[PDB]
């Protein structure tokens, strides 16, 4: 309140009225002793009820503008994370076996369900039981999707390496059974 431009009048009117109490004041000067700090006090309160509103308004943009900054800084951290993805899932397209089906296409459009089926290098087979295993993945090589795949690893549900000799007809009760066979393309 030490810089409000209505402190001078209030201060002076207080001094004139209050400080001059000991001195004999007649009933005519008493009006000046009374109706001089009055009105001035009203105006000061008016000069303080507007300052309090300007302060709050001000401290509602120095908070709503930190939030406009925060979000743009964030908008630049996700815009650079999707970019770092769509350029890492691209360096992975064996562009000899992929430009060989987009080319044999009538216009260059192909179904998406035949891209991993004809242009992939690895196969993952998930097998529930032993009966399913001998009709799908018997031996070290097997044919699927008009191709030939050679087994490379057989992990299990626990993710521990199984060998192709632990898989018997009677040792089967001793394996975590969802078995995951990883195979590579041949030729």
């Amino acid at each position: 309140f030490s810089s409000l431009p209505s402190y001078a009048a209030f201060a002076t009117a207080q001094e004139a009225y209050e400080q001059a109490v000991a001195n004999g004041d007649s009933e005519v000067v008493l009006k000046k002793l009374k109706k001089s700090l009055n009105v001035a006090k009203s105006e000061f309160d008016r000069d303080a009820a507007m300052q309090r509103k300007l302060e709050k308004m001000a401290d509602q943009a120095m908070t709503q503008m930190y939030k406009q900054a925060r979000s743009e800084d964030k908008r630049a951290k996700v815009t650079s994370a999707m970019q770092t993805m769509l350029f890492t899932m691209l360096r992975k397209l064996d562009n000899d076996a992929l430009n060989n089906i987009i080319n044999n296409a009538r216009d260059g459009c192909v179904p998406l369900n035949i891209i991993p089926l004809t242009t992939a290098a690895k196969l993952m087979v998930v097998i529930p039981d032993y009966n399913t295993y001998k009709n799908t993945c018997d031996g070290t090589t097997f044919t699927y999707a008009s191709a030939l795949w050679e087994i490379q690893q057989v992990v299990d549900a626990d993710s521990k390496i199984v060998q192709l000799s632990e898989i018997s007809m009677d040792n089967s009760p001793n394996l975590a059974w969802p078995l995951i066979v990883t195979a590579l393309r041949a030729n």
Partner: protein
């Protein structure tokens, strides 16, 4: 997070923020430790900080607790009371507080380098638990200063017994390898087993304690854990036991020692004992004696 101010034996929940171990101080230690010593930071179940976008006034000085959080002066949502007032700091146990008459404990030990003679001599006239905390702060200051040192590395593998090592440039480097350097290695981005190496001689001659396989770029730096709080005194009051009851003495007695049955009966009727023994003063063969 309800520990104990053992500077008063008071049960509190605060702790000095910018302090060595961040120990538990009551409402009457953390009141005077902050005003004189500049530890304008206290840590509670939630840190005493501003809670409004961007604020950087974090000093439990005149911070006011209102609206379920600690606001500040400069921007004023005051409508509340200050955190530090009436010879106390706000927090749980604000009523059950005792106080301390030795004000300048932190004022003397939390600012110095934990090496002055005066600190040690006034420490050796303290109680058992305060000195336990002083020893834990000595271990903690050693470990804190353990991460303000240098790091070794090898970027070029050379023929055996002739390598080169640079430590650092322009910083204040002697170390009596007492505890030797076992860092861990790096090849591209992950950690690789290296083992433990010993550097004594030192182009620069290298000795070998055990066979190893140097790789390019292997770093060496020491990581040390933090000593956990303990719950037991060091010394014990003197209290002679009732008798030697509850033991199983043996019929046979040694005869090459002429001071064996007397000391056996003594330890039988004595509780705790300390001596000043040079090497070879019973540590060699008397342990077997009391064993048999």
């Amino acid at each position: 997070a309800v520990g104990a101010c053992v500077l008063c034996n008071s049960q509190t929940s605060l702790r000095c923020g910018a302090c060595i171990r961040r120990p538990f101080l009551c409402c009457k230690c953390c009141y005077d430790h902050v005003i004189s010593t500049s530890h304008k930071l206290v840590l509670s179940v939630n840190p005493y900080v501003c809670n409004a976008p961007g604020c950087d006034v974090t000093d439990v000085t005149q911070l006011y607790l209102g609206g379920m959080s600690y606001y500040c002066k400069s921007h004023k949502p005051p409508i509340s009371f200050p955190l530090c007032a009436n010879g106390q700091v706000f927090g749980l146990y604000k009523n059950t507080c005792v106080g301390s008459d030795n004000v300048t404990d932190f004022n003397a030990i939390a600012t110095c380098d934990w090496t002055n003679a005066g600190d040690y001599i006034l420490a050796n006239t303290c109680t058992e638990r305060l000195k336990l905390f002083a020893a834990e702060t000595l271990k903690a200051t050693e470990e804190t200063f353990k991460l303000s040192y240098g790091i070794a590395t090898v970027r070029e593998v050379l023929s055996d017994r002739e390598l080169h090592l640079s430590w650092e440039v322009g910083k204040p480097p002697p170390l009596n390898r007492n505890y030797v350097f076992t860092g861990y290695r790096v090849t591209k981005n992950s950690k690789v087993q290296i083992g433990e190496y010993t550097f004594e001689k030192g182009a620069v001659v290298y000795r070998g304690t055990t066979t190893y396989k140097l790789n390019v770029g292997d770093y060496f730096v020491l990581t040390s854990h933090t000593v956990m709080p303990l719950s037991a005194p060091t010394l014990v009051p003197q209290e002679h036991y009732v008798r030697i009851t509850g033991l199983y003495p043996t019929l046979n007695i040694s005869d090459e020692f002429s001071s064996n049955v007397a000391n056996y009966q003594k330890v039988g009727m004595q509780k705790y004992s300390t001596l000043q023994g040079p090497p070879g003063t019973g540590k060699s063969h008397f342990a077997i004696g009391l064993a048999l």
